[PDB]
Design a protein around this ligand. Structure first.
Ligand SMILES: [Mn+2]
Ligand SMILES: [Zn+2]
Lengths: 335, 369
DNA sequence: TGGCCTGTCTTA
């Protein structure tokens, strides 16, 4: 795992904490710019090209049948196999939380244009949230989305302008979501007692593993690991969760896929005052510590760090500038 | 006594999502924004009043003027019938505040503009501010250490205030003046927003856009060709719906077709403004046009359609020199109020006609002025 | 390889 500094072009200001990267056919794209989209790029979606350790953001266009979704911070995203991306939730430039679901696909590639379609949701729609997970599980030749966790504003009855921005963890209900028709079913599980946000999520076959996270009520970053199995018979699905020992304690960690069936997670925040400098390896479930990479002193002495998974087993991370550039960016590679 | 949070009051019906506690003063401008290392990074410190409590303190501050104005209109001190308070709402960034890196600040403030009382079925004014634009009557509501173009932070900090003001738009305020309970109801008019902040809070594009007006849907080309017949069209609701249209692309149009459909509204509005004009800018826009007309009438540009840059420059120099000799006007390169005030005179037109050959065009320039 | 449409920086 080698660390590499990156320089950025004129629109470095667009990058902010909560951004996302999506990988389409080896090409990387960036979503969730700071501010509302400007005339220079009306969609807010960018080709994310790092050539010779230099990052260029190039405007991407949407198809005629697309939504123009707002930039979103901390939405739950996953990849769905045409190959497409699922966006649910997030914060808007106006600080509203979106409950909507957007679906991204490559509509046309000339020398890329995207199709962005919103899927309406009925039934037990999850309250709009950020900092939550969504993945796709496969059971008996059927595909279903699993959504869990996060935080949101207070409900309209208790919300008050003096604490207008105050947040609480969402109730820890598992949500099954059929993307074709847009339906949602909520499952209360006895093993999931507390709320959780900014956790890590790993989906394999009919299972989703939940790692780390932060629970607001206790203000604990629990060192538990949860396995979630989903069976899809012809009738109503069945979901069963089990607690597993050996769970790491980390919030806002980043996750990437090395080779096949091996995942590595690079640090997040282990305590409010402390940062998780170590890295973990998950084999599909067993967790082993890895040799910590050659962090520079700037990374070591920063209080805040943020990043995203690029797709190619490589992480794109960023650190805040000195008091006297706004951000300094690095790329950490694996495999 | 003079700070918000001292006198008791009531809202009927109680304000939606606003505490009824009346002993609240200075409160954190972040309004409970999460600050953990996981959440979005908060780079700002701000402090505010709860908008209602501040209205209460400002009215109690002006109690003496209200009673005396009631007297001055030949009305009784003890009347309590519904007073209507008009309130200019205002917002500006304050540039660099730093004491010595730039440290920018936003000030959200209000001004009590007028207070009328209802006697029978005549609305008689009991008070109106003599100096609306003074720093002195601009009551501060929130001060923050942030960039007016830092949209995420701005909405995060201002949105609770707007929520409170929305709440007050449909409620009556009961407040004790001079032993007698009096009842107030408010009309909020966000007229204090310069163009940049209007565009930012109403979901519109940046100032270079083709949609040049925040009152109408004209384009720069339309407004230039169509000189005068334009009407005020836009409203906050129309802008919230035009945003939703941009967002939903219901007729599956291309980005240029969609942009023409929503006439510039590409972001979601979050403040209702009353965009106006400054008398200064009327004078300045007119004077700029007259200056160009003067220099072009000296160069006689109709006869020289392919005139080069340097010929027009010498035209400008000619006009500058002659205006310095005749009107004592130091040519400047940035248009301002005093230049406009001295140039927009009939005598200045006579002076510039002294350099124009055709007197038929003297007729036209003088009538224009 | 441009006009040149857009956003940043400069000077009165
Ligand atoms: Mn301003
Ligand atoms: Zn207009």
């Amino acid at each position: 795992m080698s660390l590499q500094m990156v320089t950025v072009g004129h629109n470095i200001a667009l990058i902010q904490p909560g951004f996302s990267l999506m990988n389409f056919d080896g090409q990387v794209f960036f979503f969730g710019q700071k501010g509302w989209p400007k005339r220079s790029c009306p969609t807010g979606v960018f080709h994310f090209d790092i050539k010779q350790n230099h990052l260029k953001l190039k405007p991407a266009i949407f198809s005629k049948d697309s939504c123009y979704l707002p930039p979103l911070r901390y939405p739950a995203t996953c990849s769905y196999k045409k190959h497409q991306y699922i966006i649910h939730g997030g914060k808007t430039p106006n600080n509203e939380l979106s409950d909507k679901i957007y679906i991204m696909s490559v509509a046309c590639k000339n020398n890329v244009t995207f199709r962005c379609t919103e899927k309406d949701l009925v039934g037990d729609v999850p309250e709009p949230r950020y900092g939550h997970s969504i993945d796709v599980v496969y059971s008996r030749g059927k595909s279903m989305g699993v959504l869990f966790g996060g935080r949101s504003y207070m409900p309209s009855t208790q919300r008050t302008t003096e604490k207008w921005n105050s947040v609480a963890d969402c109730l820890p209900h598992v949500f099954l979501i059929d993307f074709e028709f847009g339906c949602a079913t909520s499952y209360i599980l006895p093993e999931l007692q507390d709320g959780l946000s900014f956790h890590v999520s790993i989906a394999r076959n009919d299972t989703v593993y939940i790692l780390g996270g932060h629970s607001l009520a206790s203000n604990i970053r629990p060192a538990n690991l949860y396995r979630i199995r989903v069976d899809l018979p012809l009738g109503t699905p069945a979901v069963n969760c089990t607690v597993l020992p050996g769970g790491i304690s980390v919030s806002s960690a980043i996750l990437t896929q090395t080779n096949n069936d091996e995942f590595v997670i690079v640090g997040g925040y282990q305590l409010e005052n402390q940062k998780r400098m170590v890295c973990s390896l998950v084999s599909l479930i067993e967790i082993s510590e890895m040799e910590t990479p050659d962090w520079t002193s700037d990374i070591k002495h920063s209080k805040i760090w943020f990043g995203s998974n690029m797709g190619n087993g490589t992480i794109f991370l960023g650190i805040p500038g000195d008091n006297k550039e706004a951000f300094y960016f690095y790329t950490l590679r694996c495999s | 006594v003079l700070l918000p949070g001292y006198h008791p009051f009531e809202w009927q019906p109680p304000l939606k999502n606003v505490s009824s506690r009346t002993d609240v003063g200075i409160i954190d401008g972040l309004s409970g924004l999460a600050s953990s290392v996981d959440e979005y990074p908060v780079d700002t410190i701000a402090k505010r009043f709860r908008y209602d409590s501040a209205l209460v303190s400002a009215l109690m501050d002006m109690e003496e003027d209200i009673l005396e104005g009631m007297r001055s209109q030949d009305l009784d001190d003890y009347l309590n019938g519904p007073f209507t308070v008009v309130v200019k709402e205002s917002c500006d960034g304050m540039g660099d505040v730093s004491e010595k890196v730039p440290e920018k600040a936003v000030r959200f403030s209000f001004t009590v503009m007028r207070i009328t009382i209802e006697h029978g079925s005549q609305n008689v004014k009991v008070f109106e501010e003599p100096k609306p634009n003074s720093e002195l009557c601009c009551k501060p509501l929130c001060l923050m250490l942030a960039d007016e173009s830092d949209h995420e932070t701005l909405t995060a900090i201002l949105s609770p205030l707007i929520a409170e003001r929305e709440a007050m738009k449909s409620s009556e305020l009961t407040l004790e003046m001079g032993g007698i309970p009096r009842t107030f109801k408010f009309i909020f008019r966000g007229t204090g927003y310069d163009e940049k902040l209007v565009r930012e809070v109403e979901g519109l594009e940046a100032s270079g856009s083709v949609y040049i007006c925040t009152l109408c849907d004209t384009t720069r080309l339309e407004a230039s060709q169509n000189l005068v017949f334009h009407s005020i069209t836009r409203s906050h609701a129309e802008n919230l719906q035009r945003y939703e249209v941009w967002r939903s692309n219901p007729y599956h149009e291309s980005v240029e077709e969609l942009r023409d459909r929503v006439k510039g509204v590409s972001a979601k509005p979050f403040i209702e403004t009353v965009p106006s004009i400054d008398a200064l800018h009327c004078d300045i826009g007119n004077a700029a046009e007259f200056y160009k007309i003067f220099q072009l009438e000296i160069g006689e540009v109709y006869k020289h359609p392919n005139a080069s840059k340097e010929e027009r420059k010498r035209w400008q120099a000619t006009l500058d020199k002659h205006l310095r000799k005749r009107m004592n006007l130091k040519p400047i390169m940035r248009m301002n109020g005093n230049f406009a005030r001295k140039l927009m005179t009939q005598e200045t037109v006579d002076a510039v006609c002294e350099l124009i050959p055709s007197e038929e065009r003297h007729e036209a320039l003088r009538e224009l002025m």
